[PDB]
Amino acid sequence: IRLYTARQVVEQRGTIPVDHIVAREAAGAFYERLRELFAARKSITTFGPYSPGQAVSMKRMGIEAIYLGGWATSAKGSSTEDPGPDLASYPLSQVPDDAAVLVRALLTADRNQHYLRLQMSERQRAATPAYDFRPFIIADADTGHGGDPHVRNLIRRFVEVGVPGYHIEDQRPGTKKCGHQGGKVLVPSDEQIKRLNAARFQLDIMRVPGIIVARTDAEAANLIDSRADERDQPFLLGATKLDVPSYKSCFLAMVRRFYELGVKELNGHLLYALGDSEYA
Amino acid sequence: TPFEQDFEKDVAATQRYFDSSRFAGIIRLYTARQVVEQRGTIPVDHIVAREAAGAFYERLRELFAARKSITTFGPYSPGQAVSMKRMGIEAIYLGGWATSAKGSSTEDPGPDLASYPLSQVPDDAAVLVRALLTADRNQHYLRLQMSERQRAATPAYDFRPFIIADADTGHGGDPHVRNLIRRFVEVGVPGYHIEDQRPGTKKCGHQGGKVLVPSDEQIKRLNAARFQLDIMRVPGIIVARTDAEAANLIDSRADERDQPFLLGATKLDVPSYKSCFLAMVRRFYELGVKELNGHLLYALGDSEYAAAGGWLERQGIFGLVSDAVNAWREDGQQSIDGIFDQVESRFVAAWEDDAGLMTYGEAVADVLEFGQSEGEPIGMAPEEWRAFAARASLHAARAKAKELGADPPWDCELAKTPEGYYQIRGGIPYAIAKSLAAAPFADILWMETKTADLADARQFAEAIHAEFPDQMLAYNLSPSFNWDTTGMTDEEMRRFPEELGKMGFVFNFITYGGHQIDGVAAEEFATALRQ
Amino acid sequence: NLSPSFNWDTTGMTDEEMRRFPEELGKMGFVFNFITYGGHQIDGVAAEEFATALRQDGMLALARLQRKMRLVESPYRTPQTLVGGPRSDAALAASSGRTATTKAMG
Amino acid sequence: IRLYTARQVVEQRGTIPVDHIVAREAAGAFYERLRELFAARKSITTFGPYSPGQAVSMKRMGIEAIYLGGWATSAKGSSTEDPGPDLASYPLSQVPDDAAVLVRALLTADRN
Amino acid sequence: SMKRMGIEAIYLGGWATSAKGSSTEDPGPDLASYPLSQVPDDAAVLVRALLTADRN
Ligand SMILES: [Mg+2]
Ligand SMILES: [Mg+2]
Ligand SMILES: [Mg+2]
Ligand SMILES: [Mg+2]
């Protein structure tokens, strides 16, 4: 389902022709291959390469496609980004920039392989394996790094450097926790679907049949940032004893007591303006 | 041990820094120890940002005390920035509007959606800082070749990087804010502004759909920024912007400080705004307008669709939908864009009218006024209730109203947008409330304004200064605000900047002025070359 | 190439000779002739002028700029349109299935 | 005169299709226009735009083509390059990076 | 990892920089034909990693 028309796509495209041929052709062949494997109940088993050489080696060893994730992108950093944990707090250009290196390595490996194969005899070619360096990549788009214009920008940046596949997850950006059992925060399904739909819109504009992967984090999620979506509402937890003061007010009253008893470092209650009656 | 001593020494130095007059009245939600444990052992120093921030802040304090101000604009090139300083403008603004318009080698230019990567404004600022430092090196080289008399005769320009740059909404949560501030500091920028909008919701050419975040979220952005600046030992200038003057929506009802401004329905048999909107779209679809399929974004139940349909029928909206589809057919089934927009406008007006939208404070006031008119004994005076409601959480307001035997029907859930955003009473009072909450977490406060109006500015400034008399302010001047259709005299326009300064607006800026003059210059030169 | 730093007024050329110079180049098969860093120069002059005007005449500096834009019907008079506001709004409508709220109540 | 053969070009290209459509189509039409002007003993008279807006404005005012020079690129600098004189001492990516901004502005102006 | 294992200093060469490429530079042989920013940009990543490891 697209929440827009063909006319709405065309009116974004202008008059000067563009063509994202690497992403377009890779996406076509990659999708067909995945459909083939699905029909046969077979699969590709891969890993995230950490260097262009790793990506090329994977294809030489027979692995048919490549994963690229934000965890490793965070760990690697860049000339302006300090390495760190998987918070998707890098600029939204970060994973596309990393993917661009992999695509260039793959296309370059293809050029170098072909150059050598042109110098071979027909029998030598039949005897010597030719590796498949097509850029079959699914890359991490995190939560889309904001709203629809962020999603579209991120997808655009992936497509421009030749990436045919992208994954978007139903988390709230900027809430990722390290080494905690709680505090994983979802967004409503309408917000997630609009990310997926925005991605499709951008791919359509660019004439790239890119592969959209929808990830859910609901298996271990604890929280959601809105109660508005009907599809989330069956999973909402509520109090049934309505004379119990709010969780929030109780938490803040507890912190304030620590503070008043002399633990000056616990001053987080000063973030809020809770009234006297509610504190009481 | 040496290890423990080294740590305790930096903690002590960091505490002295925290306690210095620079940060009088600022609340940090963390300790000196929490800063020091982030810093490692290998020394770093962001000397350009650190020294610029010190001198810039002192100058702003000086101007504030004298009720004077800097009036500046956003340079669109490094040359513009150097030129401004040569002409005697003391500081520089850098905004996201112009950054969006300019694009980059990988970013298409476009509208001000802050949808560029969060590196975008820092990268633009880096060019300006390098230009300023380079201008200083070149000026000094030439001045060293001069005689003493030549130096006394020839003006030396001040190329110090006194820049306040746009950090938008912080481009996410605390790690995004800290990353953005880090990137600014590393390239020498001493000042940053953060606004209380929800990222990814900016609208182009609409009177609605401006979406705020709760004050706790905004304050945490400001606090995260201070934390990063503290780690980096840069006394950077934090500017807290509020968009509440013209905001329509907020993405949460959870913060007590926003709750007095929430709008709720007072006629509770009206079906939800959301369900009515979706039922309207679904009717267009079912009547054969396949392009209006937005209702397929949601999974609304049959009972809710039916109730919303009942309302749309009764109010004549389904009549308007029928008329609209017939007109669409008569016109050859082209884009429904304009026809749909017109029906949507009528729908919104009809829903608002029937729902009886007001604040909870207004709803209770109506009940108390009625009691008074009926000659029932007053539990509290109208003005007394309004004063109470203005600073009360919804919980506290309801509890107090219940004591007074005023329990009016009021439901802010019914009035939520399809996205799930709450409607709020935007205006200068809301801007004041958000800004007062932010004041202990920021060095400068700014109420975003569309129109240049001294009375509006005064209302804001006087309200802030009643609680925080030492609070420096900043004022934006939109390049697209038509000055000539205000009817202001030439002299009123001349005096406007000075008038701002008198009210404690110390740093006032024509956001994308550079972009505008760049365009005019190019048009003129291209025309002249051709002719 | 036409150097921006070459002093045209000290050539002794008439105004009309300066007007005709580009056409004269074309007649000799110079098909593409260019003032190399013209943009840099006009950028500088524009900034000097505006900064001076702002310091001297406050917001009248902006009013005068706006007047010039109206006079020549520049697209800079509606900057939000110039940078693509309308097409971006249409992209939001497509991305959200026209469910994004743009109309106000109050 | 090319000092190489068609075979020498093809053996560099690999097997995975690429297409630089914007440069390819612009170069075709631009060259044809210059040949037309040359035949008519006419010319384009232009200047180096210092911003994307300047480039878009030039085209709006009817200038048919754009120059981009190293002098201005040196003067402008970048986030990592100090501005300075025309020494072509910037990294070789510098003028292409500046040109990329102009191309994006032009394509975007066309879309809008 | 090198520093964790006790190696006291680090080398960074153009051969490997050429082999790695970048978002705009195709990988290839050691011709030092990358922009002159290329090896500094690669070194910047290493310095940030080292300072970050120290902080952690
Ligand atoms: Mg991720
Ligand atoms: Mg303050
Ligand atoms: Mg040159
Ligand atoms: Mg070397």
Residue numbers in the entry:
A (entry chain C): 38 to 317
B (entry chain B): 12 to 542
C (entry chain D): 487 to 592
D (entry chain D): 38 to 149
E (entry chain A): 94 to 149
The article reads:
We determined the crystal structure of ligand-free ICL2 from Mtb CDC1551 at 1.8 Å resolution. The 766-residue ICL2 monomer crystallised as a tetramer, with four subunits forming an elongated structure (length ~200 Å). However, the ICL2 N-terminal domain possesses an additional helical substructure that is not present in Mtb ICL1 (helices α10–α16; residues 278–427). The C-terminal domain of Mtb ICL2 is unique to this isoform, with no sequence homology to known proteins. The C-terminal domains from two monomers associate at each end of the ICL2 structure, forming a barrel-like structure. The association appears weak, as confirmed by small-angle X-ray scattering (SAXS), which gives an experimental scattering profile that can only be explained on the assumption that multiple conformations are present in solution. We assume that crystal packing has selected one of several accessible conformational states. The activity of Mtb ICL2 was measured by a nuclear magnetic resonance (NMR)-based assay that directly monitors reaction turnover 15 and a fluorescence-based continuous assay that relies on the reaction between glyoxylate and phenylhydrazine. Both assays gave comparable results; in agreement with previous studies, ICL2 showed poor isocitrate lyase activity using DL-Isocitrate as a substrate (kcat/KM 755 ± 70 M−1 s−1 at 27 °C). We then tested the methylisocitrate lyase activity of Mtb ICL2; no methylisocitrate lyase activity was detected with Mtb ICL2 alone.
Isocitrate lyase (ICL) isoforms 1 and 2 are key enzymes in this process, through their roles in the glyoxylate and methylcitrate cycles. Each subunit comprises two distinct domains, with the N-terminal (residues 1–590) and the C-terminal (residues 603–766) domains connected by a flexible linker (residues 591–602). Enzymatic assays and molecular dynamics calculations reveal that ICL2 is activated by the binding of acetyl-CoA or propionyl-CoA. Our results provide strong evidence that ICL2 may act as a gate-keeping enzyme, allosterically regulating the glyoxylate shunt and the methylcitrate cycle, an essential mechanism during chronic infection when Mtb uses lipids as the primary carbon source.
